[PDB]
Amino acid sequence: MIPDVSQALAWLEKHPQALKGIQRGLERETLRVNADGTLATTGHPEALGSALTHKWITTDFAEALLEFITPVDGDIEHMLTFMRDLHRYTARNMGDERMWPLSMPSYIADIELAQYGTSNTGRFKTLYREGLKNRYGALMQTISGVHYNFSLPMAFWQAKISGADAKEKISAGYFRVIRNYYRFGWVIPYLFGASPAISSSFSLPFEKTMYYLPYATSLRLSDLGYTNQSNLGITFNDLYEYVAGLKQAIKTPSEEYAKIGIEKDGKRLQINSNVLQIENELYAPIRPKRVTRSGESPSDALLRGGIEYIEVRSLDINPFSPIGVDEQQVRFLDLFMVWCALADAPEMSSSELACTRVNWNRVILEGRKPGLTLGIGCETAQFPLPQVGKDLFRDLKRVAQTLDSINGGEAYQKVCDELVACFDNPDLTFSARILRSMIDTGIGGTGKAFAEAYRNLLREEPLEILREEDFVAEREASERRQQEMEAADTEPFAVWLEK
Amino acid sequence: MIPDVSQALAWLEKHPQALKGIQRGLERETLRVNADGTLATTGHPEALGSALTHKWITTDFAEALLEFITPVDGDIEHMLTFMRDLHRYTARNMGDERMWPLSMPSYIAEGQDIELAQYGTSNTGRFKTLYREGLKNRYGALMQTISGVHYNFSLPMAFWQAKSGADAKEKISAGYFRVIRNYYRFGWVIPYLFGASPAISSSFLTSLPFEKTESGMYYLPYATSLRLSDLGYTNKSQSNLGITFNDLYEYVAGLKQAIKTPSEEYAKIGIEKDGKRLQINSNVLQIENELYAPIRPKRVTRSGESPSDALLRGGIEYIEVRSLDINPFSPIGVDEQQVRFLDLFMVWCALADAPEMSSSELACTRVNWNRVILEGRKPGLTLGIGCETAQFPLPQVGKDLFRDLKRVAQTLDSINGGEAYQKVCDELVACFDNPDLTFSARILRSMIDTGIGGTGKAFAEAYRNLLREEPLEILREEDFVAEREASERRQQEMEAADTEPFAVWLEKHA
Amino acid sequence: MIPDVSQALAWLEKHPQALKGIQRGLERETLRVNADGTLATTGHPEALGSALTHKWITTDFAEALLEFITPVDGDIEHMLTFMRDLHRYTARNMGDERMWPLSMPSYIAEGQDIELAQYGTSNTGRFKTLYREGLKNRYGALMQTISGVHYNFSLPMAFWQAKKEKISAGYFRVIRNYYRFGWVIPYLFGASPAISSSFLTSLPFEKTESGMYYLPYATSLRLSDLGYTNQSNLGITFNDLYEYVAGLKQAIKTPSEEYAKIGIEKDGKRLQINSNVLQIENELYAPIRPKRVTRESPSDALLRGGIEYIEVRSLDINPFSPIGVDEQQVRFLDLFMVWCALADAPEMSSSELACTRVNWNRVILEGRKPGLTLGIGCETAQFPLPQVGKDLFRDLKRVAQTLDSINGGEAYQKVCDELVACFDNPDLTFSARILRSMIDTGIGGTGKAFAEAYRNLLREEPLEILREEDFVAEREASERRQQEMEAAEPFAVWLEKHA
Amino acid sequence: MIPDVSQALAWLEKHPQALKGIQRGLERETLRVNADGTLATTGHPEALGSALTHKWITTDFAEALLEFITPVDGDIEHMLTFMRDLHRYTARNMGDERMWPLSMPSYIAEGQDIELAQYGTSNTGRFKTLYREGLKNRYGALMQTISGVHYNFSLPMAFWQAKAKEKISAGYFRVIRNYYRFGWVIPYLFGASPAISSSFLTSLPFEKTESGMYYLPYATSLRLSDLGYTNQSNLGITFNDLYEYVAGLKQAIKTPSEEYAKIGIEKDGKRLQINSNVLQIENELYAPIRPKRVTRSGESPSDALLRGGIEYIEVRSLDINPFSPIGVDEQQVRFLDLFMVWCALADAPEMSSSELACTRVNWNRVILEGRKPGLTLGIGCETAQFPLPQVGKDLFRDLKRVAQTLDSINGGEAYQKVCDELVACFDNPDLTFSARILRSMIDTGIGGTGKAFAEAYRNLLREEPLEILREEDFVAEREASERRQQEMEAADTEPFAVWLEKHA
Ligand SMILES: Nc1ncnc2c1ncn2[C@@H]1O[C@H](COP(=O)(O)OP(=O)(O)NP(=O)(O)O)[C@@H](O)[C@H]1O
Ligand SMILES: [Mg+2]
Ligand SMILES: [Mg+2]
Ligand SMILES: [Mg+2]
């Protein structure tokens, strides 16, 4: 089932320095909770300053949904330590509150939306969330995940580009990465899916107790999870075609969202009633990215510069790491992304893209089932999952050797040897491990225990990159940038909204 | 420019009885106004009963906009007499109100004050009003007060028989779609002859070179029908929306698709606002009647059936011509000369070969319409084929068509007896050598002398005094009294039969 | 979800004359009714002679249920004109009676004493009537008044020669594809979204004030559990001729716990032919049936000659045709049957067959629901129905080009353009159009209104293929054959050798 | 609205090789500005040598208005790389100055004293600066600081030889007529001046931003509007016949102007214009597209046309592409190939002076409100009827057939891919250059937007290595161009007035 990538792997092995200088970033979301596991109804801890402007710590959907973001970085350990400083400082600055360490929340059935002050941008961001709330439900929006941001170094593109060609070849390369990701990225929830159970608050042969599926990996990625939009016809063959379909989705009115109404009794209910209010609403396992200029839209930035990096969005929170993600995951992603850059990925119509999802749903719902077979697209399932994983890992192993030869060491090769074991025994995967524990003490019980351990752990750990003066300097600089904005507001909200 | 139809005309001259039994109906709208020309703000007159259910008399968009509908009829004079009886009874049962005799109303200061047609509290009645609420929010109430006449026309079965099974209704449909394609190509002769709205109040408003008076009357020196221009209406055209007239299923699918397509323009309006519903939905067409159409294929519906359902089921039954302005020179807004001209022209449209046309070929036929609409009376105006450079002097094009219409008139006259259709040809062909004979030249002189306002007020008074004194000829007073009672009763029965509140009922109909 | 069929389509475009000479037949059933909609209790109209032996007109289950059958034909227009002649002649030879124009009846009470079809005193006749007595006693007579159209179809020899056990295997392939994808038929042409209460479940039925039940997005309740349906317990499969015939012969001798409780007799009156799951082979309910013209039981004919043609049985009555079917349906079935012969169909166990039913039931019960998704077999629903239909029609359109090139014109391509619009807009389907009419006037009002207008239309049309002499000649010939049969052992004794 | 070109296209599909050997050239103008966005007041950068004589790099109206010009070329990639070398070299040889990336300048006051392009002391150099003085006094300097891109285009002789010089001329006049009719598709897709500095100011429904920027919500190219680089229609110039064209043009040059006679010829001995006729010289006639033949020594544009006929056409309608560091990209060049071939194929009836003026009605709609939902277009001056999207899709049906023919002789599917990309702009005007740059200007202003683009493009182009021309080619051309100017300056030339009378 895995394509023949031998040609490209030989190329890579002749060009080991093509891979030097991979850039990465991480985003991790966590709900602030009280000791009994209920959702904290207090505001964004004052020590964090302005969620709207803060360089490293913000909120996602809810006022109580923290999100930490690491500055782009060439060093895995540096990035992971940075993320941990963010967690350490926050753990010691939120009273008795602790951070929920699971993807799926459990003590939620009326949740406060993220608050960003009174500026226009800050009211538009909250309004968007009101929109999502009304369209999808507040509950689904408290599900947590980790995003992994990744770019190959220029050396990679050079080793295969001058002037206008460069931005085009890099975009073609990332769209290829994206097509291969749709085809083979179910390997991620297989290994690291960590939500085989959901609370009642959220058709499928569920076992009841808390609801679970015996072989499930990542329900966060199922229909009951963070999802929504298959009618949009978005494809990943070509930069212009991609943006055209996405820009088109932005201008597509939805009847169902028109039925919600743009406003009801003085309270504005959503930005508009198109399929996507803004481009961020397009749910995706993986996303093409390019840092936007001030106020610039995601697709404008892409049209102007091409794809800059990619955002992998499929990771559940790692319940076994106090920061929700670990080095073993990051390194596997490097390997798998590089592999996705190397393998031939024919173009895919949107019905072919829907066919790639068949393997994902098998993995999401019953990935650990003994005897599970997978197919090529919609074709008859005939490839036993363990052999597919092992074929993939043969390739990843060659990538690991190259990465290790330039960095020094065997860190990547070790990762491969650890994770390929999960195909021989699914009981090694995050979801087998976490289900055992949720069946033992429930989602609530399990999450509270981890939350408590991780809080006591992170509260005692000295900072390593950031000093307490860096957080205080940024609390000041961030809260200031927000006032700088709130004053500078020419027109009033209702008018700025129109334009 | 006029195609060669000698082969079909020779066919017709050999089968004169193929035309025996043309069926017709008329609808005519008029605003109820006070002596001053302003819209009456009283309810639908009591003597007229329920606008919702009445057989002959209803309301269109506004509560002050009357509409009169004759039952399908094979006799022109009988149908026009019936129409006049409706006007006569109404004229004497509307208090001090009278009927506005022009397509174009005089100055209106606040379109948003115009009361929409009220149909009582039944769910069906509230849906009809909500439809109008939607039209108002989408296009504004003002343009909806512009009025016209619809001419409904069907050829007899004997026409098609002189030209089996499942094929019969398909051949009839293809014949009517042929009529429609020819109407698009050549229908501009209608506003040329009978357009009667060369002026518009500024309160209803371009780079058009309008002449202006101090009361706000805007006019174009050679215009025929501003009602049919982009200033005279508000909706998207079938033409503009992508709908074609080559094949029935194709036509029905485009229409049904427009009903199902959401609109960002209309979502911006919102569906509700302060607990007041503003539209039925936010799709391109709330319902099928919302489609702007100068000519419409029809089949009478059965209960539950949408207009396009009935077309799909039984094919095209008849066509509705919608391009006629109100005739300001008739108390009933329409006369025999017009009806007879349309008989000749529709029959000609059924005889002339009409190649299929794509959306853009259809859009091209409108080039000549726009020339006629805005300056049809300009000395030296030339027309062209579709979008090609204009090279055909209008007078000669009209003379050529009338040569054919004259042969159709000879046939219709030989079967009906007399010379009535032939006289109409001779009367009307003269308008091509003298545009000062057309309706629009006549009504422009009038409006220069006394404005839209003074012209309508003076005709409205004169016509009121004719109509309120003339004896009923077909319907008698007791027929109006009975239809009033029966219509009120049908409305009471619909109100009592509802079982679901409107909000709930609406969800299964929106 | 629609398999890739490009090799077979390329093969076909290279061999266009492979499709020249498709053969077809139509069967249409219709209840004889009075102007008030009630079931006529007169006998089989006299002008039609013997229902038992007549060549073109007969009865189905009920003496009042007419059935029209066209002789196998290679021309579509000819076949539909012939069927129409039969309707014409019948319309003007049944007093004030007319033909009910819908699949579902309205003015029939449950347990109503419906006269079973009567075939005279011959052993054969008494056996046909006894079969129906069995059906009546097993399933009730109400269900048996639901009517339908069957479409009979065979590819020419030219088809197989361009590619006898090859022909059987080809038709079994057709059958397997039909089970997988044939829900496309009730979607487009289902015309029974409402049911009278007589036929009454956990289905979310709506009910009108006048007492009619319906499902808002239903296509064909004739094909639902409440309709003309089941028996899957028999484990018949469609992989091999002998396997099929064996399962069927076995079914006829499998005893029924349930039907034994009915008994073979009460009070000197025989109640059923036997107490097995199937009294005869024709009792096996099926959306589609392998056929060979018999001399001989249906399975004997298949063993002797192999599959000669297939009978599509899923068509509801077309309420918009005076004859219950139109050219659009006929051409679509050509296209789709040819497509079924071209797409690869793996073999299927009886549980893989049971799984094909999931999409059928979805389409039957809510096929018009916005956002309906289908799945492969029993797996997660993930393919939006419009996208699947358009996927299929890309292939059908290529088959249509081929049929049009060898036939002249564009009639098949026109039908694709028309029917593909129903995937964009389900309100264009038969069931949407007929539901608007039924919600307003009822099954009863809608059927009466249509029946009245078709009666007037058909009475006025002249015959075109058949002459009155032919109906007269056939009445006489058929009555002769019946009495010649009655002349040619008493019944209870003959039955001991055939039950 | 789009004419039927079925027959011409069927002809082309059976003669694909009639198109092989298309020649092209680009000109792109850009203001030198400081990092704060103000107009540089330094002279033409030294490393560039003599603007008067340089082969590739020159000035337009102002001393700070750089202009880059590619030598005629058959290969698109090669022409764009050449253009890019010119920008690379220049960006690293102008101190801390950078290139303004937009058509409309900001931070330039109306009645700002803008230095005219300086060409030295020769007759030719003095003549060129004088013509610019004429322009400044006739139309004002400010408008002349608007920049654009010109696309120069010729079909191979191979194309005329499949369907002598008189027939090539007639063929380019047909291209010009169709270009007047349908060329508004260019500002629609690629216009990029929807906003305008206050400096340039009407009955137009302008929005003002708090920042203070004027814009029309649906505009595409205000550069092409009456407030931009525009107007002269009453000269009665027509494009039906070569000799009729030059006759009209030659007549306009001799037509006195009483408005310009009021400026005077001299004031305090200083000449203020070349003459007071409606056109000082042929190049003063504004036009969206121009017939060209390369001129010999002492030949006017029209002299060259009378001698050898039309050689190629110049499309003048392109705004600067704000999203390309060189102000133009391959997608635009390929579209114009397709479009210019289509203009050569489609029949174009002859048009009178006033029919040509009537073609401006559609241009002005597109210019002022081309991205307006539901915009309709008309034929000539007649009522708008045709939805803009439907018109673009019909055009692109034919362009796709041209594209297929060009791709088949070039290999690949690059032309077809462009058709697909741009037809999408008819379904969504938010894809167009003007929708995109307006978003950016509403958030950050013209100045803010231009500065950020100019800064990014400076850092980008200063790091890219030269590909076709090396530093040494620029040094050699610098020195050669300086030498050519010195030689013209040292020549024993005629008295200036006598020399004027004998020009053109
Ligand atoms: N036969 C041809 N076909 C296509 N392009 C040509 C041809 N001959 C010259 N060119 C191009 O035309 C352009 C000439 O530009 P330039 O020397 O600036 O003259 P110009 O356009 O007459 N001056 P301006 O007044 O600024 O328009 C170059 O880009 C040449 O590549
Ligand atoms: Mg992220
Ligand atoms: Mg009407
Ligand atoms: Mg006169």
Ligand SMILES: [Mg+2]
């Ligand atoms: Mg049958």
Ligand SMILES: [Mg+2]
């Ligand atoms: Mg130039």
